[PDB]
Amino acid sequence: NLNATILGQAIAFVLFVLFAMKYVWPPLMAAIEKRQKEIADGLASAERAHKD
Amino acid sequence: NLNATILGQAIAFVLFVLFAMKYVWPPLMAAIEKRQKEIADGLASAERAHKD
Amino acid sequence: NLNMDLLYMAAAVMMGLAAIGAAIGIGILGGKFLEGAARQPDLIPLLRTQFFIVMGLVDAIPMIAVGLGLYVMFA
Amino acid sequence: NLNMDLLYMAAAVMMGLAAIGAAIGIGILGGKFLEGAARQPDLIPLLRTQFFIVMGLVDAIPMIAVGLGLYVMFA
Amino acid sequence: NLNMDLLYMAAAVMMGLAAIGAAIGIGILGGKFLEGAARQPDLIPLLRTQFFIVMGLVDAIPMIAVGLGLYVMFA
Amino acid sequence: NLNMDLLYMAAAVMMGLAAIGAAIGIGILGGKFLEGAARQPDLIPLLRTQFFIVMGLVDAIPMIAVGLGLYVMFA
Amino acid sequence: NLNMDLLYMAAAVMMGLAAIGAAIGIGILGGKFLEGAARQPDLIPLLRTQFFIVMGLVDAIPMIAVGLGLYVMFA
Amino acid sequence: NLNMDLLYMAAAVMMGLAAIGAAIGIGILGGKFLEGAARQPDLIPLLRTQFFIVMGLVDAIPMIAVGLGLYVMFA
Amino acid sequence: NLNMDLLYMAAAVMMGLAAIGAAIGIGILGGKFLEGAARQPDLIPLLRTQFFIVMGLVDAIPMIAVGLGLYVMFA
Amino acid sequence: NLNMDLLYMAAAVMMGLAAIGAAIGIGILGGKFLEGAARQPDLIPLLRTQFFIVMGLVDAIPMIAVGLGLYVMFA
Amino acid sequence: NLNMDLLYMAAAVMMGLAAIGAAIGIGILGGKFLEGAARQPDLIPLLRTQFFIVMGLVDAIPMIAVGLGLYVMFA
Amino acid sequence: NLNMDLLYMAAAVMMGLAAIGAAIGIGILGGKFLEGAARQPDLIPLLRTQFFIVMGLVDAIPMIAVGLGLYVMFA
Amino acid sequence: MFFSVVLGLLFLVLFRSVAKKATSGVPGKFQTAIELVIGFVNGSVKDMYHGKSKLIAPLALTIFVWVFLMNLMDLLPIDLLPRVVPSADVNVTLSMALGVFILILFYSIKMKGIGGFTKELTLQPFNHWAFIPVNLILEGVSLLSKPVSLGLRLFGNMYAGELIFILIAGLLPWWSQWILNVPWAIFHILIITLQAFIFMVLTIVYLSMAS
Amino acid sequence: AMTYHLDVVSAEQQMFSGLVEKIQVTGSEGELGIYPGHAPLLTAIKPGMIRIVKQHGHEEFIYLSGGIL
């Protein structure tokens, strides 16, 4: 009879965006630990280890 | 789709992909090489400092 | 003249070459269930009989097509 | 002229290419039941014979289709 | 004269030789799931039952084709 | 003009493409019974010969269809 | 008179005998994934379940053919 | 005009697609009998040759159908 | 009157019963790759995934036939 | 007008879809004979070559059907 | 009126149901080559890649049939 | 009007669905020869290459049928 | 011709705007996704695109990122609901870009290094054994022409399925299954883009690595 | 990690002991990747060092001549 697009678009967009963004935010947001931990821990551990 | 579609679609995708990739290759390569240069510099500096 | 060709072609084409999947699945399931059920004693009657329940799905496969044959004869 | 083509096409199409599934399932079940039943002695006659009961389903597969052939001849 | 041949040929061709894949897949899945599920005790009821969920896809295979048969009769 | 097409199409369609299941099942049963019967000595002649009894069912499979060919010629 | 035979024959031939590959592939993939996943539980967590992703291709195989059925009815 | 279509269609349909079961069964029986007969020395020539007797049944399977081809030509 | 039967029969016959090989090959490749990849974890990193490259050939199999469907509609 | 449809339909139907059994049996016999003949050294050339004699039966399978093609052209 | 039915029936019948053998052979060769290539490390890239050369024969199998489709359109 | 339907139906029916046995046999022989040839080193190149000679028979199977296609065009 | 303006202008504006935007990100920085996108795309594309070696340098990442980001606009427009004025650019640009890019990339990449001697004189053992000249024309025409059929069939089927599903789903009556059926368009667009980029990069690296 | 006890017995006394989990050792057919949850499969172990985790993450390469799984 009608269309009912706000329920499907809002429920699908909010559910898929919140579930995919919240559940997939660790892979895209936690990926900086390799370069940050490798550069900071590598430079600090290499300079302190080479100096000591 | 009757006429005048092959020149626009072929020249648009070919000129846009070739003109965009040729003029964007040094920016994406130099701008994207920071992960390999920083990872290789940190791993080589840490391994060379520990081995030395 | 379309009633004889439509009813005969509908009953023969709808209830003809269709039992190959059911007859092949019954022999394949009977051979696999017989080899797997006979290869072990404890598996002779504990779960292999559940495979016979798969035969109950045959009535919903090609055997249900025969239920439409009346549509080309009685209906 | 629709009785000859309808009855002949209904009997030939309804009782023609249909025994491939039953004949293939009988040979597959006989070979699998013969290999599995002959590979072990205790399994030679304890459960493998139950696979022969699967042959009883053949009468409800393609062999039942021949029961409709009379509809293209006697009926 | 096109309604009898079109409706009969559409219902027979659309709901005729199509259950061979579902009936063969049910017997193959039942035999493989019965042999693999009966070959091990711990695997008798832990993941093998998930194979039964594959049967739920049968309704989206040939069984859905019967849903179009009404288009050659009711519609 | 329906006697030539009905009799020829009925005899050829009813006694034509139907021996594939019996010929394939005979070779599959002969190869499986030969490999399983030859893999063991005691199983060479004790139960494997019973598989030959399955060949007796071939007369009730496609070979019986030839029995209907007379209906398109003698009858 | 070509609309009834062309639309009915196009919808029946285009949405008829086509589910044999999807239904057979679903049963073969369910039986192989059920036996392989049942023989090893450590691989039943992030390996055999990937085979279910292959089912996602079924929508681009025979199930897509049903999408053309509207061309013989709605279009 | 029914003699050319009935005789040509009867000889082609009766002596056409029928050698698939015999040719497939000969290759399957030859490969299975060759692998099983070659895997063991004592099983090389003691019972495996009996599988060749199964080839004698081919003359009563699809090869017999060619015997009906004369009915669409000489008779 | 040949445009409806030629276009409908060409689109349905050219894009109808053809996805059985691709859908069956996807399920067979998914089951074999799932069993081989599940039986060995070390081989599930740079070997079984290569089988997915075979899926790239599906576009050159029956999926390309759909590309001809426009010839029975748009062209 | 029956000579073109009878000769073309007889040559195409009699010499068309028939090489699937011979071509499939040649590949199955070649793969099984290659695996069984390559799995053992002593079995590389002592009995496996006898399987090649099975290829001699191909001339009596689908290859003989081509011998009837002249009946739809030269005769 | 024979150009539409002859060209459409020739293009659809000549380029329709033919990709089942190539698509099935690609999946069977990919699954067998993936399992045999993944079961051994040294055999992962020394002979199994030669199986990919078999894919080169696909262009001489059903893929060559598409080369005749132009005969039903351009020629 | 019989030249277009006879030549098109003869070329499409004689050079259409026929590559399934050759394409399936090439993939089965390539997968079996690749697995058996890769499972052993000494069997990698000593007898397995002889299986490639079986491919030479493909030219006498379905590939020879294309040789008759000229009879529906050039002749 | 005054027609075909919304397809060329809308396709060239969205394709050139999203494709010609890598010149401003050369100096940095920009946020938290620069290290994950650059490290994941460079490490995954360089580590997963095995077969280049002596092929090229910036053509792999530039052609993969430019072809994926530039070609992703034709298949990522399935969410736009609402007549033969903006759909021909996807089917024409997809087959024209796939066939022209595969033929121009294979012929230009194969006719640059080595070379003119292997392609201009491909006889001897490859066409003299085999003394008839049919194996080089059939194998060379089929293998050299398989990229136009594969790229044209995959790109044409993906663009035709996305445009037909978007137009039929956006131009219907109810808004339930048509407005909520985003799994087939998202999975088909993502699988078509990943399969087209992986098949194009693997086919260009494998075809360019050997002569 | 540690799960099932994968003790090794030599010709005289005991060769190895302790629990094991993801034991990536080669089987009879070739290279395999077993872990915790496999069924009973009697295979053969030939020569070659296989890196398998012992206890508390002890990935040691146990190399021996003969072996019966």
Author numbering:
A (entry chain J), B (entry chain I): 2 to 53
C (entry chain M), D (entry chain V), E (entry chain N), F (entry chain U), G (entry chain O), H (entry chain T), ...: 3 to 77
M (entry chain K): 46 to 127, 140 to 268
N (entry chain H): 1 to 69
Task: Quote from the publication.
In most cells, the bulk of ATP, the principal source of cellular energy, is synthesized by ATP synthase. This molecular generator couples ion flow across membranes with the addition of inorganic phosphate (Pi) to ADP thereby generating ATP. Like the analogous complexes in other kingdoms, it is based on two reversible motors, termed F1 and Fo, connected by central and peripheral stalks. In vivo, subunit ε is believed to change conformation in an ATP-dependent manner to prevent rotation of the complex thereby conserving ATP when its concentration is low.
Three different conformations of the complex were identified using 3D classification in RELION. (A–B) Cryo-EM maps shown as surface representation, states 1, 2 and 3, respectively, resulting from rotation of the central stalk by 120°. Three of the four classes containing 104,510 (State 1), 67,829 (State 2) and 53,587 (State 3) particles were movie-refined and post-processed in RELION producing maps at 7.4, 7.8, 8.5 Å, respectively. In all three rotational states of the E. coli F-ATPase, the εCTD had an extended conformation, albeit with a different proportion of particles observed at each state (46%, 30% and 24%), suggesting State one to be the lowest energy. In all three reconstructions, the εCTD is in an extended conformation, stabilizing an overall F1 motor conformation similar to that seen in the thermophilic Bacillus PS3 F1 ATPase structure. While the overall density of the c-ring was relatively weak, 10 peaks of density were clearly present when viewed from above, confirming the stoichiometry of the c-ring to be decameric in E. coli F-ATPase. Interpolation between States 1, 3 and 2 to simulate ATP synthesis by E. coli F-ATPase.
